[PDB]
Scaffold this motif. Structure first.
Motif, PDB file in Angstrom:
ATOM      1  N   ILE A 177       0.763  -1.366   0.088  1.00 25.93           N
ATOM      2  CA  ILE A 177       0.341  -0.199  -0.184  1.00 25.93           C
ATOM      3  C   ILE A 177       1.013   1.563   0.584  1.00 25.93           C
ATOM      4  N   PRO A 178       0.263   2.317  -0.432  1.00 25.19           N
ATOM      5  CA  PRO A 178       1.436   3.165  -0.800  1.00 25.19           C
ATOM      6  C   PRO A 178       2.013   3.963   0.661  1.00 25.19           C
ATOM      7  N   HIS A 237       1.945   6.650   1.796  1.00 21.23           N
ATOM      8  CA  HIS A 237       0.620   7.715   2.279  1.00 21.23           C
ATOM      9  C   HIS A 237      -0.672   7.177   1.700  1.00 21.23           C
ATOM     10  N   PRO A 238      -1.857   7.732   2.342  1.00 19.57           N
ATOM     11  CA  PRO A 238      -2.071   7.978   3.510  1.00 19.57           C
ATOM     12  C   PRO A 238      -1.763   6.834   4.379  1.00 19.57           C
ATOM     13  N   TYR A 239      -1.301   5.970   4.230  1.00 19.79           N
ATOM     14  CA  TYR A 239      -1.637   4.428   5.622  1.00 19.79           C
ATOM     15  C   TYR A 239      -0.203   4.777   6.941  1.00 19.79           C
ATOM     16  N   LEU A 299      -3.683   2.913  -7.695  1.00 25.77           N
ATOM     17  CA  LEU A 299      -3.632   2.902  -5.999  1.00 25.77           C
ATOM     18  C   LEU A 299      -4.327   2.872  -5.652  1.00 25.77           C
ATOM     19  N   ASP A 300      -4.979   2.509  -3.916  1.00 30.96           N
ATOM     20  CA  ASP A 300      -5.979   2.830  -3.338  1.00 30.96           C
ATOM     21  C   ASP A 300      -7.439   3.099  -3.611  1.00 30.96           C
ATOM     22  N   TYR A 301      -7.854   3.230  -2.850  1.00 30.05           N
ATOM     23  CA  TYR A 301      -9.188   4.012  -2.447  1.00 30.05           C
ATOM     24  C   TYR A 301      -9.192   5.436  -2.138  1.00 30.05           C
ATOM     25  N   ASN A 302      -8.377   5.118  -1.204  1.00 33.65           N
ATOM     26  CA  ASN A 302      -7.871   6.574  -0.542  1.00 33.65           C
ATOM     27  C   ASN A 302      -7.456   7.295  -1.355  1.00 33.65           C
ATOM     28  N   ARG A 303      -6.166   6.702  -1.963  1.00 33.66           N
ATOM     29  CA  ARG A 303      -5.702   8.002  -2.715  1.00 33.66           C
ATOM     30  C   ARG A 303      -6.874   8.038  -4.107  1.00 33.66           C
TER      31      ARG A 303
END
Ligand SMILES: C[C@@]1(c2ccc(Oc3ccccc3)cc2)OC(=O)N(Nc2ccccc2)C1=O
Lengths: 54, 443
Positions: free
Chosen positions: A1-2, A4-6, B431-435
């Motif tokens: 996972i990236p 940011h923001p994790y 990229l993920d959902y949050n991104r």
């Protein structure tokens, strides 16, 4: 996972969690960790009875 | 002859209702050839967990013969007159239509009525189509674009009826009963929920006459002539990721909840989508295309194709986009795509809409290019708006749209919303959902 923001968010959280004890110690118990002996100007001729490191 | 004048001189669309509740509408022209069919307000959304894929199963038998005339007889009669029998079933709408010589409009109407009312539902044909449908599900399972849209609905409307696919489940298809299909037909193929539409060289009064003669079977109780309002389908900002790095390209679809047929804002959304437009690697235009996203796609080789959409329904809809890209360019594509959506809500130009509006006009005019497409408009229009909407009205509405309007409407449905996402294929770079969710604001 990236990152940011994790982990940026997780890291900022960890920061404030450790920041409490730090500030609590520094603001409510400034000298809990130091040797009272260090409030006495160095004297080349007298060695403290119990020399103990940090 | 100016665009305006041509719009006003278009023959009006006639509508007349029978006592049984059925509606008959048609647009008259001077064409030796015509199209007529019945547009039913039925589909997968009306089905449930047990009969999902019934309306589809039915769509397969609707042409294999009636009671008055078995298969071979039915086919021969239609084939031998040079008529074309097609049709489809979707989530909220079904249709069975015929292309033929205006000279046969009446015999056709009889045929239509016979199909929608007396389908043979041959017990043996049912088991036969059961296997055909199962093969069609495997064929469609390789259609990424459709797998992606199914998934988009599966998550965007999870927990509800629009979540289901039109074709249905494997378990349903393996166990749907002759009685279930029968029940389906009786429950949904009903006069007040149908529309007899026709276009070409036909007499509205002759059409309505044959209509009176074959579309009879009136109802007695009140429960038989009332059109049931469907329960709302909840939208959910979410995502479904089906990964398979063995697939050559990746499909991505992102969307927000749309307003629903009756809402006027739809004219604006369609203008908006017109600004972003669409694209694919064979648009000679290339790097000079007006659509900014299309331009960037070409310059940076962001995708193989992309397309915007504003799918409507009775009470909701899906406004979004879909693209196909190599595993390594998904992120930049999504970046630019979301970027453009932000631009819409925030910095749309008068020039931009001027163009988008023209593009939209010629697009609506194109959806009336033949008797079948026009007939489809009529059917859909009455079924969705309960009345036909002239090209002149549309043009009237389209003309009122300006940059500010696009911004407010787009800001309304897009800005800072939680989208629905469906990704299929080699999607690791997405990229993920949050991104993604962050690409929904500021820009
Ligand atoms: C803070 C402290 C300290 C810090 C890091 C150390 O680690 C080393 C650094 C360099 C070389 C060897 C050890 C050692 C002592 O510095 C210092 O003067 N003291 N005090 C002390 C008292 C008695 C014996 C030895 C040391 C420390 O604890």
């Amino acid at each position: 996972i990236p990152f940011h923001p994790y982990y940026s968010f997780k890291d900022i959280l960890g920061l404030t969690l450790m920041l409490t004890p730090f500030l609590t110690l520094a603001l409510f118990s400034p000298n809990l960790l130091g040797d009272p002996e260090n409030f006495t100007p160095a004297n080349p001729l007298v060695t403290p009875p119990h020399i103990k490191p940090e | 002859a100016t665009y305006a004048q041509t719009l006003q001189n278009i023959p009006e669309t006639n509508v007349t209702t029978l006592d049984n509740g059925l509606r008959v509408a048609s647009e008259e022209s001077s064409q030796p050839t015509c199209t007529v069919g019945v547009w039913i307000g039925a589909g997968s959304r009306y089905e449930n967990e047990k009969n999902n894929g019934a309306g589809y199963f039915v769509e397969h038998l609707a042409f294999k013969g009636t009671k008055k005339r078995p298969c071979a007889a039915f086919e021969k009669e239609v084939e031998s007159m040079g008529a074309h029998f097609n049709g489809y079933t979707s989530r909220e709408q079904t249709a069975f239509y015929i292309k033929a010589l205006s000279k046969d409009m009446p015999k056709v109407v009889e045929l239509l009525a016979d199909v929608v009312q007396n389908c043979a539902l041959e017990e043996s044909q049912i088991e036969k189509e059961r296997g055909v449908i199962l093969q069609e599900l495997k064929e469609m399972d390789n259609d990424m674009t459709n797998v992606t849209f199914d998934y988009l609905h599966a998550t965007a409307f999870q927990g509800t009826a629009l979540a289901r696919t039109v074709e249905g489940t494997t378990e349903n298809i393996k166990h749907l009963t002759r009685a279930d299909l029968a029940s389906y037909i009786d429950t949904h193929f009903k006069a007040p929920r149908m529309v007899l539409a026709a276009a070409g060289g036909i007499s509205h009064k002759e059409l309505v006459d044959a209509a009176r003669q074959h579309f009879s079977g009136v109802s007695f109780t009140y429960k038989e002539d009332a059109v049931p309002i469907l329960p709302r389908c909840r939208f959910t900002g979410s995502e479904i990721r089906a990964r398979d790095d063995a697939l050559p390209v990746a499909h991505v679809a992102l969307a927000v909840e749309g307003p629903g047929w009756a809402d006027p804002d739809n004219v604006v959304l369609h203008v908006a989508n017109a600004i972003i437009g669409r694209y694919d690697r064979t648009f000679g235009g290339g790097k000079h295309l007006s659509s900014r996203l299309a331009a960037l796609a070409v310059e940076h080789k962001l995708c193989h194709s992309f397309q915007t959409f504003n799918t409507s329904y009775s009470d909701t809809g899906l406004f979004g986009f879909h693209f196909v890209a190599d595993p390594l360019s998904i992120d930049d594509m999504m970046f630019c795509a979301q970027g453009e959506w932000m631009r819409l809500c925030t910095s749309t130009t008068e020039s931009e809409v001027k163009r988008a509006k023209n593009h939209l006009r010629s697009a609506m005019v194109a959806q009336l290019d033949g008797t079948t497409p026009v007939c489809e408009t009529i059917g859909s229009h009455l079924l969705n708006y309960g009345r036909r909407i002239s090209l002149e009205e549309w043009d009237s509405r389209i003309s009122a749209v300006d940059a500010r309007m696009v911004r407010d409407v787009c800001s309304k449905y897009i800005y800072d919303k939680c989208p629905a996402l469906a990704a299929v294929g080699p999607i690791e770079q997405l990229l993920d959902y949050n991104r993604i969710r962050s690409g929904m604001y500021w820009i």
